Amino acid sequence: EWAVKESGNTICILNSPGFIPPQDWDVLTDTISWSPSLPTYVVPPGDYTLTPL
Amino acid sequence: ANVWGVRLADSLSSPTIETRTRHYTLHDFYSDLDASVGKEPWRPLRNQRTNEIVAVQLFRPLQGLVFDTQLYGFPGTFSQWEQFMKEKLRVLKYEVLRIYPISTYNHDRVNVFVANALVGAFLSNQAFYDLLPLLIVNDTMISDLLGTGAALSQFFQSHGEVLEVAAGRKYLQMNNYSNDDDDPPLFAKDLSDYAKAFYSDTYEVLDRFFWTHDSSAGVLVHYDKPTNGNHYILGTLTQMVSAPPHIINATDALLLESCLEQFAANVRARSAQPVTRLDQCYHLRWGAQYVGEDSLTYRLGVLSLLATNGYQLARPIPKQLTNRWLSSFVSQVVSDGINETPLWPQERYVQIAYDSPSVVDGATQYGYVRRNQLRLGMRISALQSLSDTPAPVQWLPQYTIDQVAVDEGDAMVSQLTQLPLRPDYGSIWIGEALSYYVDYNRSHRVVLSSELPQLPDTYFDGDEQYGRSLFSLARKVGDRSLVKDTAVLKHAYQAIDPNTGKEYLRAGQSVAYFGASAGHSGADQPLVIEPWMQGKISGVPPPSSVRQFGYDVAKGAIVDLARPFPSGDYQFVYSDVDQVVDGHDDLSISSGLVESLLDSCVHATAPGGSFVMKINFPTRTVWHYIEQKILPNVTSYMLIKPFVTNNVEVFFVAFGVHQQSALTWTSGVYFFLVDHFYRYETLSAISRQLPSFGYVDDGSSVTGIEIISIENPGFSNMTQAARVGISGLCANVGNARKSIAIYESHGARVLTITSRRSPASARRKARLRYLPLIDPRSLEVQARTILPSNPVLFDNINGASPHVCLTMMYNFEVSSAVYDGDVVLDLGTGPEAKILELIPSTSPVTCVDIRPTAQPNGCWNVRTTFLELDYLSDGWITGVRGDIVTCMLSLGAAAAGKSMTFDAAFQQLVRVLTRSTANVLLIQVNCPTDVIRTIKGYLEIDQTNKRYKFPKFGRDEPYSDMDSLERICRAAWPNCSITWVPLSYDLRWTKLALLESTTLSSASVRIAELMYKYMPIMRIDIHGLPMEKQGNFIVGQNCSLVIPGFNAQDVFNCYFNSALAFSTEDVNSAMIPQVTAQFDANKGEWSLDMVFSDAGIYTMQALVGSNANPVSLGSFVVDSPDVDITDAWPAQLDFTIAGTDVDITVNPYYRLMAFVKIDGQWQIANPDKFQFFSSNTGTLVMNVKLDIADRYLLYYIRDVQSRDVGFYIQHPLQLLNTITLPTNEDLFLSAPDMREWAVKESGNTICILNSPGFIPPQDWDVLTDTISWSPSLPTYVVPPGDYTLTPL
Amino acid sequence: IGEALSYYVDYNRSHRVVLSSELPQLPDTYFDGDEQYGRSLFSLARKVGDRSLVKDTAVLKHAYQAIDPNTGKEYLRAGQSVAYFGASAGHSGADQPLVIEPWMQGKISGVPPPSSVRQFGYDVAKGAIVDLARPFPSGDYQFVYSDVDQVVDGHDDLSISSGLVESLLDSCVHATAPGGSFVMKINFPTRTVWHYIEQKILPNVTSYMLIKPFVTNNVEVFFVAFGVHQQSALTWTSGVYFFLVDHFYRYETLSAISRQLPSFGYVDD
Amino acid sequence: VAVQLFRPLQGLVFDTQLYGFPGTFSQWEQFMKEKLRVLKYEVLRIYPISTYNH
Structure with a gap:
């Protein structure tokens, strides 16, 4: 699990059970991650850092 | 080859390497009598059904028990028997040590006969001390x-110079042995006197x-590395x-066991892995006279x-044999048949074929003769072991x-x-229930009640009743009333009053x-009431209270609704009173009941x-009465039919009752009713040809299950x-899925083939002058077990x-386009010819394939x-002749393969066809009939x-506009006469789907229609x-239209989906807005x-x-207006009401109107949140009533003016999400989702919106009516300074 | 013990043209008692787990790394049938073969998951059973993977095996997309098979590659061809010759070494 | 408390005590299963299914 962190906020958890992606995000079928199973999202302009676990 | 009902694999295999023989030594004797945990001279045999130990197998030192089991006095339980034998052997080992110390005697050989005799004598308490001096071999x-x-x-015993030694028990059975079905076969070796060895x-x-x-009794010799x-x-x-059907003497038991062991070794043999002895089978040397000619021994x-x-x-x-398997094998062996194998037993010697892979001839000096002339022309390989398949596998025969x-x-x-059995009837239709609705329009033409259609005259007859009952029974849905009520409520609540521009029904209604x-x-009670009260349905807000009146009601009161009854006024009446209860099985009485219920509903409702009422049987009298009496007293009306089963019923919704107005039926109502009746008629016609729900098939019905079984x-x-x-079954089935299964039943192995018939299958079979024959190689190969299924x-x-529905629509159109006796040329076909199944059997074909x-x-x-x-190549089309030309789903793929534009490939095909003579052309072309839009997930x-x-x-195809195709056809051929066939809104194509064993889902049908909208069929005459x-x-x-061919005083009729658009004689009575000619x-x-x-698509006939x-x-074809939406927000944002x-x-x-995307479903935005008013060329239709939660929700503007929601306008409101939150004034807030939503002020969190224990702060203010999409979610008014929210 | 080793060669435009006559051939003494014993012993004492899974993973990882000489893309893409x-x-x-599940769920790094997998074979339990040598009613597919052996439908004669190889190759060419x-498996490569490969396949394909995952010593090789049904001028290269010579030499030396070992379960005298 | 007999097992015309049924549903089921298995094996012995299948 990874924690996506917008400036001053915790948006969501990448691989938590029952994870609901934010509405503003957009999902693409490219899946350009190294593992094809993991998806890839398009994000609003504000997105800064991630924290493990 | 088959021996007697026994099937043998085409391959041949045999072990090759012989392991050398150990010579039994005294140290091994002591080790065996130690009965160590690893080297116990016994192996338990477990029942396969219950995994319980019932018998044991005795090895070298324990062999020789020749007396009755009562004399030995074994405990009878495996653990107790094991301990008792361990103690006995431990006692005997010490005496053997005492006479023969291991310090002196270590490598001296041991007489195995003397060892077995000593063990048996000690266990039987009978003079063991004499054999001990004879233990060592001189x-x-x-x-x-x-x-x-x-x-x-x-x-x-001693007989001259031959030594006769009695044979001890090989297996020993415990008390749990009950001759069960799955018990191990003991092969008569558990008795004292089964055989003697000389x-x-x-x-x-x-x-x-x-x-x-x-x-x-016959004597058996072994000829390959004897035991001693x-x-x-x-x-x-x-x-x-033990095998129940048959009783077998000792010799047959020994032969059976040896044959099974040798066959297992042959199956599991490997080139490198050696075995104790190559040959496991005994050979009958003497006793041919007493053996019968066709007995089991032979x-x-x-x-x-x-x-x-x-x-x-x-x-x-099986790895461990069972009684059932042995009984089945014996029953097969003693079955009827002949021996095709050239081998025939002889008592002189064992015959080995010249091609036999067995190498036992070299190892043994005497006893085997290899015949040069005798040959077995079969390959050499070993069978591969496969796991048993729980379900039958599909098979495709080859001719x-x-x-x-x-x-x-x-x-x-x-x-x-x-064939005679009861099939498990499946659900022909599944999925959600789509709805068709029409709305009153001012601009539409005035239509009198005289020309509105009725229900068909033959509605009440045995055949139609049977068809509709079968359709209702086969449909798989839950709580039809629930889904119908939800659909009608969702469609009714979205209505907008022409006055004040607001909705007709608001929150808090009674x-x-x-x-x-x-x-x-x-x-x-009805299922819809509780979610409606609790606000579970997104579209509808909860009402104030629900009162129930009906004959069968439980919570409410039971009344006769036709007659006046004591009840207070209500401001929304929802009625589902069936008209058959008091109809007296007469249609006119049903219409009178409809009128009475109309009067009752009008009186009951508020000023x-x-x-809303359900009309069970529409008819012209009902429409006339409505138009004459109630339409003047209402403001707007709505007709909605939710389709769950085939019925003509419709739900009538009227708004603005008790107010004087001028209303009349519109052309849209006429079109809706015409299409509804046409759909019901075609669905009934399709459904009438299906068998009963619980029928017993015997081949009479056109559609059913065909099964044959072949035993051994x-x-x-x-x-x-x-x-x-x-082959006859394959011909009867006619190119459909076939499942095979091989299993064991009643002592025999049976093959089962299952498939389904169809009218198209019969049509194909009518073309067979002679029956073709299959190639049984694939079934010959299968050396495994496939379990059957119901x-x-x-x-x-x-x-x-x-895609299946699309290609099936194409197939149905092709089949309907061809008349009897017309030669047809099919340009695109796969290896299997489905065109040979659709057309009538009289008309010839000429199939062209790459x-x-x-096919035979x-x-x-x-x-x-x-x-x-x-x-696509030229120079070949001249020879062939064809009246009708079909090319489905092939032109675009061929153009993509050669990497050329669709225009070039189409033109090349036109030239090729021009070099031929064909009156009618059917071409599948990739052109957009309507405005270019993307079907997400299926066709982008x-x-x-x-x-x-x-x-x-995963493929991709080129496309081009239809105008280029029309230009090409009219340039190449004058009098092209392009016809685009209406097939999107027609439901007759479901004949192939439903008559043949195939299930349909409503969503799949909708996607198929939308896909076909962009891939039409271009018919050229x-x-x-x-x-x-x-x-x-x-x-x-x-x-403007030009028709030069026809002369004066002619008639032209235009049709739109089985509905007459207008006629030349009466341009005034045109249903479309204007006709001038x-x-x-x-x-x-x-x-x-x-x-x-x-x-x-409109079709002209003259x-x-x-x-x-x-x-x-x-x-x-007529195109829709361009879908381009531009939204401009004002400079300032107001956050008041x-x-x-x-x-x-x-x-x-x-x-x-606006929609919300939550989870995987689409939700309707709250009616009070968005209010679209002043509709015109320029629309001031946006009253947002902005919210704090809008920063986390994306609102989509969809299209709802057609039968399908969206697919024409889906505009996200990106500017709605990016809104500046003021610090000066108060702001509305609501829970974005059911999940816990922490609310964050400047630097702190004040509470959790959806915590189990939630107490709102005293500063907040709660509105009377909510603004969130879910009505159950309240709306608060925070003081200035509350900005952000965080999940959980 | 250990994992599987993969040796691969690829078509290179700069290499020299080599005809099928100069390519090495399967040894004449391949079908002999001692050779069969040695190879069976090596297969029996290999401790590899499951051979099919590792071989398929290796060949798929090497196949998806193939670039398109035109447009500079990858021949195999996600969602292909x-x-x-x-x-x-x-x-x-x-x-079903164990390779399908990681391929479908995308667990394997190299291969993106495909849209759908249809199985055909004599011993298949999910798909239909057919005779692959003769025409069968199924349609076209973008990617065709074949692991059907040459020993069942082909008798012990080698020429019949070569003809069966040619027939399966024709079936695969007919069944693939434009x-x-x-992907084709050659159980018993020989000179006539190579000549057929060249003369038939190479004019009609854009690129090819020879791969062999090493799990057991034998002449089994994997042939993959990209850009099928596209006119092109292709021929054998020197790299293929070197790869074939090394393959044959390695098999010969390993078989000769393994022929001197005792059988699997034996008594030592 | 009771069972219903279908097309087979419908010839029981003698006294209930002559059959010696266990009197409990599970034991009755086991007993009747074994008896029917014995009768089935007999009728298979005299009538093979490979000849009189249909």
Whole structure:
């Protein structure tokens, strides 16, 4: 699990059970991650850092 | 080859390497008597069914128990027996040590006969001390044991110079042995006197001895590494009764066990892995006279001869044998048949074929002879072991050049079938229930009640009742009333009052549920009431209260709703009172009941409310009464039908009751009712041909399940019985899915083939002059077990894929386009010819393909040719002739393969067809009939680069506009007469889906229609009147038409989905907004200036005049207005009760409202949140009433003016998400989602919105009515300074 | 013990043209008692787990790394329709070959998951059973994978095996998409098979590659061809010659070494 | 408390005590299963299914 962190906020958890992606995000079928199973999202302009676990 | 109902694999295998023999030593004797945990001289045998130990196997030191089990006194339980034997052997080992110390005697050899005799004597408490001096070997076992007389004559005996040793028990059974079905086969070796062994150094001396000794029971010699020395095994009269059907004496038991062991070794043999001995089978040397000619001993000798030479069973052999398997094997062996194998047993020697892979001939000096002349032309390999398949696997037969008479095939199919049984009827239709609705429009033409259609006259008859009952029974939905009520409420609440522009029904209304009843489920009320009260349904806000009136109601009161009854006024009446209860089985009385219920609903409702009623049987009298009485007293009306089963019923919704107004029926209502009746008629016609729900199939019905079974089948040498039966089944089925299964039943192995019939299958079968024959190689190969399953007619649990529905629509159109006796040329076909199944059997074909076809060619009633050529190439089309040309789903794929634009490939095909002579052309073209839009997930298309993309299948095809195609056709051929066939809104194509065993889902059908909208079928008829159209064909614009061929005083009728758009005689009575038409005199071209309200495909047919013969002309398409939406927000944002006003530009044709995407479903935005008013060319239809939660929700503006939501306008509100939150004034807030939503002020969190314990802060203010999409979610008013939210 | 090793060669435009006559051939003494014993011993004492899974993973990882000489793309893309000729349910784990599940769920790094997999073979438990040598009613696919052996439908004669190789090759070429690719397994490579490869396949394909995952010493090799049904001028290269010579030499030396070992379960005297 | 007999097992015309049924459903089921298995094996012995299948 990874924690996506917008400036001053915790948006969501990448691989938590029952994870609901934010509405503003957009999902693409490219899946350009190294593992094809993991998806890839398009994000609003504000997105800064991630924290493990 | 088959021996007697026993199937043998075509491969041959045998072990190759012999491991050398250990010589038994005294240290090994001590180790065996230690009974160590790893080296215990026994192995438990467990019952397969219950995994309980019932018998044990005795190894070398424990062999020789020759007395009755009562004398030994074994405990009878495996653990206690193990401990007792361990103690006994431990006691004996110490005595053996005492006489023979291990310090001195370590490598001295041990007489195995003396060891076994000593063990058996000690266990039987009988004079063991005499054998101990004879334990060590001096010269030879037989020489040292001959003439001694030291032990009892029961163990071993001396007959001159041959030593006779009794054979001890190999298996020992415990008390749990009950001759069960799955118990191990003991092979009669658990008795004391099953066999005797005569040991000698030379075989000649044994033969001389047996010259005088009787051999009535027959003697078995082994010839391959005997256990101790050259010996003869003479059987006894003891028999084995464990296999229930058959009783077998000792000799047959020994032969059976040896054959099974050798067959298992042959199956599991490897090149590198060696075995103790190559040959496991005993050989019968003496006793041929007493053995019967066709007894079990002779057959078992043949099987042993086969096993030695390298044959191997086709059926799998379990690792541990069972009684059922042995009984089935014996029953197979003693079945009927002949031995095709050239091998025949002889008592002189064991015959080894020249091609046999077995190498036992070299190892053994005497006893085996290899015959050079005898040959077995079979390959050498070992079978691969496969796990048993729980379910039958699909099989695809392949045909050959041989042909048989059809009558023989039919007779053998009848003989071999298991046809009479009860199939498990499946659900023909699944999925959610789509709805069709129409709304009142001011601009539409005034329509009198006289021309509205009725229900069909034959509605109440046995056939239609049967059809609708079958359709209702087969449909798989839950709580039809629930889904219908939800659909009608969702569609009714979205209505907008023309006055004040707001909705008709708001929150807090008081509703009355007429006709409520206690359903089968333990709810005692309609299912929709509780979610409606709790606000679960997104579209509808909860009402104030619900009162239920009906005959069968439980919570409410029971009344007669027709007569006046004591009840207070209500401001929304929802009635579902069935008209059959008091209809007295008369239609006029039903109409009178409808009128009475209308009067009751009008009286009950409020002066400003509304009411809804279900009309069970529509008719002209009902429409006339409505128009005459109630329409003047209402403001707007709504017709909605939710489709769950085929019925003509419709739900009527009227708004603004008790207010004077001028209303009338509109043309939209006429179109809706016409299409509804047409759909009901075609669905009933399709459904009437299906069998009963619980029928018993016997081949009479056109549709059903066809099953045959072959017991003990023979595939290596087909007897022209099973082959003909399977070929007849394949012909009857006619290119459908076939499942095979091989399993064990009642002592035999049976093959089962299951498939389904269809009317198309019968049509294909009618074309067979001779019955083709299959190639049984694939079934011959299968040396495994496939368990059977119960048959199901509609085996498709889920509905068919949209691509399947699309290609099936194409197939149905192709089949309907061809008349009897018309030669047709099919340009695109795969290896299997489905075109040969659709067309009538009278008309010939000429199939052109780029790949080889698997269909047989020799036997066909009419001319059927398959050509291995590419059709896009030229120079070949001249020879062939064809009246009708079909090319489905091939032109675009071929263009993509050669990497050319669709225009070039289409033109090339046109030139190729021009080099030929064909009146009618059917071409599948990739052109957009309507505005270019993308079907997400199934067909995504980009206007740039001119290409199509199919996600699920992964291919891509080019596309081009239809105008280029029309230009090409009219340039190449004058009088092209283009006709685009209406097929999107027609439901007749479901005949192939439903008559054949295939299940349909509503969503798949919808996706198929939307896909077909962009991939039409272009039908080109040469020698036809060319209709010329000028300008653009879009709704709301004038279209001019030119028809030069026809003369004056002619009639033209335009049709729109089985509905008459207008007629030339009565331009005033045109259903479309405007029709104007002039002959134009000398030019001879009628000019028709007309405008269409709704987009689609319209077909022109013309009557010649002064005659009753109509003539079909070309068709045309009308496009929808361009979907371009531009939204401009004001500079300032107002957060009061009056939301910001956003002016947008949208064509007035489209009706639009907001939707919310939550989880995987689409939710309707709250009616009070968005209010669209002042609809015009410029629309001030945006009253947002902004919210704090809007920063985390994306609102989509969809389109709801058509039968399908969206697909025309889906505009995200990106500017809505990015809104500046003021610090000066208060702000509304609501819970974004059911999940816990922490609310964050400046630097702190004040509370959790959806915590289990939630207490709102005292500063907040709660509105009377909510603004969130879910009505159950309240709305608060925070003081200035509350900005952000965080999940959980 | 250990994992599987993969040796691969690829078509290179700069290499020299080599005809089929100069290519090495399968040894004449391949079908002999001692050679069969040695190779069976090596297969029996290999301790590899399951051979099919590792071989398929290696060949797929090497196949998806193939670039397109035109447009500079990858021949194999996600969502392509695939077929698995010769599926077997012999193994205890699953009815379908174990390679399908990681391929479908995308667990394997190299291969993106495909849209759908259809299985054809004599021993298949999920798909239909057919005779692959003769025409069968199924349609076209973008990617065709074939692991059907040459010993069942082909008798012990080698010429019949070569003819069966040619027939399966024709079936695969007919069953593949106009712009797709296919994978073929050659159980017994020989000079006539190479000549058929060249003369038939190479004019009609855009690129090819020879791969062999090393799990057991034998002449089994994997042939993959990209850009099928596209006119091109292709021929054998020197790299293929070197790869074939090294393969044959390695098999010869390993078989000769393994022929001197005792059988699997033996008594030592 | 009771069972219903279908097309087979419908010839029981003698006294209930002559059959010696266990009197409990599970034991009755086991007893009748074994008796019917014995009768089935007999009728298979005299009538093979490979000849009189249909």
